Amino acid sequence: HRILDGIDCTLIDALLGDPHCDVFQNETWDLFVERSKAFSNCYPYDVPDYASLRS
């Protein structure tokens, strides 16, 4: 399978385009591995039905 290691990015952040996540622009994965070491670091946001927008 093709694994993309998110490191200190959540997939949602990656998408939204948080500075320290722009490493990931345009990337493609079979399985996206969200690490517990991960954070966010840009305007503070909420996404109602975050749940689903990740999925």
Partner 1 sequence: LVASSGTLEFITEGFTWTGVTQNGGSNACKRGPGSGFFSRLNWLTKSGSTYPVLNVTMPNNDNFDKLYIWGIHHPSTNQEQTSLYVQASGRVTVSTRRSQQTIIPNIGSRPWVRGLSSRISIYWTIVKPGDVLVINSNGNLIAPRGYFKMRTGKSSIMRSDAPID
**Can you tell me which of 19, 23, 27, 54 binds partner 1, judged by CB under 8 A?**
54
* Burial zone of 51 (CB within 10 Å; 0-12 exposed, 13-18 middle, 19+ buried): exposed
The single residue listed with the structure tokens 């999925």 is 55
Q: What x/- string results for residues 20 through 49 when contact with partner 1 is judged by CB under 8 A?
A: ---------xxxxxxxxx---x-xxxxxx-
Altogether, the residues listed in the chain come to a count of: 55
**Can you tell me which of 11, 21, 27, 51 binds partner 1, judged by CB under 8 A?**
11
φ, ψ of residue 24 in degrees (nearest 5)? -95, -5
User: What residues line the site for partner 1 (CB under 8 A)?
Assistant: 3, 5, 11, 15-16, 29-37, 41, 43-48, 53-55
